[model samples]
Target: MKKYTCTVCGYIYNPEDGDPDNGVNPGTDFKDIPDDWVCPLCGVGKDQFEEVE
Candidate 1:
């Protein structure tokens, strides 16, 4: 699995530790995130994020 970063607020999305605050469980892959998922930090859409190494 890979990680992603919110371009707007620099929030790191880790597949191993999903956004629990958003009701996303840990171990959930980025691709499994809901389509309407947004950056909890900045409210940016998923499109505003980019995969990170």
Candidate 2:
């Protein structure tokens, strides 16, 4: 699974380990994440997240 980094706060969003506690299902890719879903840590826009390893 690929990962994304929240440029604002450096939060790592791993697709294999989605934020289930916050309603994000497991294995959900970053592209499938809701447009309204902001950075989990810094609350920035989805645009703030960028691909990483």
Candidate 3:
């Protein structure tokens, strides 16, 4: 599985329970990030996401 980290705040997107207030959810696929899904903590764009090792 792929891991994603926020560029602005270093917040990790846990697949178990994503930020629902930001339109992200547990069932949501990492590869299919919603266009409206912005980081809840930092409000960064998807481009700011980095792959974890």
Best by lDDT: 1
What TM-score does model 2 achieve against the real structure?
Answer: 0.89
Query: What's the TM-score of each model vs. the native?
Result: 0.91, 0.89, 0.75
Runs of candidate 1 exceeding 4 Å displacement: none
As a TM-score, model 3 comes out at 0.75
- Per-residue lDDT of model 1, residues 14-45, tens digit only: 98889988889999998889989999989989
TM-score of 1: 0.91
- lDDT tens readout by residue for model 3, 1-53: 56789888998877767667767777666668776677777887878888877
**Model 3 lDDT, full chain set:** 0.76
lDDT for 41 in candidate 1 is: 84
The better-scoring model by TM-score among 2 and 3 is 2
Report the number of the highest-TM-score candidate: 1
lDDT tens per residue, model 2, 8-40: 899999899898878899999999988888877
List residue ranges in candidate 3 displaced over 4 A: none
Candidate 2 residue spans exceeding 4 A from truth? none
